[PDB]
Amino acid sequence: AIGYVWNTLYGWVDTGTGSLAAANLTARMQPISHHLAHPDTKRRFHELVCASGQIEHLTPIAAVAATDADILRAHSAAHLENMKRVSNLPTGGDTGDGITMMGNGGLEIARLSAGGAVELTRRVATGELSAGYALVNPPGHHAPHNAAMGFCIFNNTSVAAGYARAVLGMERVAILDWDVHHGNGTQDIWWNDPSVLTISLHQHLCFPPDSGYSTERGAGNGHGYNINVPLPPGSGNAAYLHAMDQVVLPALRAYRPQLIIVGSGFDASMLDPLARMMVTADGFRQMARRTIDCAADICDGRIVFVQEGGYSPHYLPFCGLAVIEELTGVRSLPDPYHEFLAGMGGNTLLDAERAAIEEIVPLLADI
Ligand SMILES: O=C(CCCCCCC(=O)Nc1ccccc1)NO
Ligand SMILES: [K+]
Ligand SMILES: [K+]
Ligand SMILES: [Zn+2]
Numbered sequence: 001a002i003g004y005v006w007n008t009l010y011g012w013v014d015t016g017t018g019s020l021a022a023a024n025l026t027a028r029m030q031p032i033s034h035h036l037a038h039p040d041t042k043r044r045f046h047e048l049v050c051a052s053g054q055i056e057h058l059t060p061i062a063a064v065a066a067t068d069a070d071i072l073r074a075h076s077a078a079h080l081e082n083m084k085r086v087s088n089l090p091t092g093g094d095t096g097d098g099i100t101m102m103g104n105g106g107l108e109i110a111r112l113s114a115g116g117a118v119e120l121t122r123r124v125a126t127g128e129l130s131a132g133y134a135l136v137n138p139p140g141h142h143a144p145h146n147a148a149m150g151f152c153i154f155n156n157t158s159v160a161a162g163y164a165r166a167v168l169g170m171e172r173v174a175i176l177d178w179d180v181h182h183g184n185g186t187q188d189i190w191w192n193d194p195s196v197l198t199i200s201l202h203q204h205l206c207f208p209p210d211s212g213y214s215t216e217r218g219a220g221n222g223h224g225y226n227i228n229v230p231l232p233p234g235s236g237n238a239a240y241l242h243a244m245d246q247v248v249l250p251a252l253r254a255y256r257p258q259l260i261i262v263g264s265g266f267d268a269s270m271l272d273p274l275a276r277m278m279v280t281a282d283g284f285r286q287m288a289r290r291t292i293d294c295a296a297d298i299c300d301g302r303i304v305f306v307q308e309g310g311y312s313p314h315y316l317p318f319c320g321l322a323v324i325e326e327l328t329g330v331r332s333l334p335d336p337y338h339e340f341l342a343g344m345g346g347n348t349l350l351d352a353e354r355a356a357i358e359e360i361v362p363l364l365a366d367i
Helices: 008-012 040-051 068-072 077-088 107-125 156-166 183-190 235-256 281-298 314-326 340-341 351-358 361-366
Strands: 001-005 130-134 171-178 198-201 224-232 259-264 305-309
Touching: 001 107, 001 314, 008 040, 008 235, 068 077, 068 107, 068 156, 068 305, 068 351, 077 107, 077 198, 107 130, 107 156, 107 259, 107 305, 130 314, 156 171, 156 183, 156 198, 156 259, 156 305, 156 361, 171 351, 183 198, 198 235, 224 235, 224 351, 235 281, 259 281, 281 305, 305 314
Parallel strands: 001 130, 130 305, 171 198, 171 259, 198 224, 259 305
Antiparallel strands: none
């Protein structure tokens, strides 16, 4: 029984009229209809879930607004307070990094995004659902304990993990983040804490800058329970699956989480503007399959996917659909870009990709 979260307001996130930063006359950055992070990309994934008939194989789960209590399990009081402040401003405004915006009352959507993750998590853990996908927006993984950052207001997976820890009494939770950018926020939150294993695969130094080196391993009792797997630009299916087989899956098995939460971004895709990676819908399909099978093995199948980044409105929907299909076990639509993208490469493990991955294998010892 597979749960699925979509809220209409996920598609109503106001990304303004700029490209990344706001439009800017002095810099001559012309206004544009669709900001890189415009909600249409994720809405098209939702609509494809419905139009493809996958929705008939899913159990719709209503998002519930994350409470202050919920948020403070992952975030500082100062941060919550600050988000309330910014959300209450007449126009809303900058959440702190000059780029991540929230409109007036935008906290509502932020709360629904984190709360979608929490609700799906709650229902998978009760045993009502076997697994699910929370197609939330805004994303979460850059938001650290005490800030918003990189389109992220709250760290959705960390709020969910926190809930699983405090409310559901789970001793260990794993967050596996395959969004192409470093999950610095998640890393920060659980830095000193061995009870949440935080793994990030990412294009090395893609975003944030100066972040996501494999030397970043946690501290105190949490040392050895943060694993960064920085990969070179041009990495594709072969590199991603090698990282899964050599680091990710071994790591999950060593750690023995009671729940696996996947920060599922699709910005590693072949056609994404915001990274240089070569993962195809079939690549994501194999990644999802391995992780679900792993959960079946080690934590009674308890696996919760939570949407992170991805910026191709054309291609993201098919990458997302492939993951949904691995959840439902109904595989009823081709990737219509498959042959076009297959010819481009990425499906051979290059020596430099193998070496980047090899660099992390020794860290498994400390789990
Ligand atoms: O998919 C994503 C988004 C990655 C890119 C976000 C960039 C936001 C940004 O431009 N931040 C910034 C850059 C320079 C100075 C200050 C803020 N998250 O994983
Ligand atoms: K940790
Ligand atoms: K990542
Ligand atoms: Zn990303």
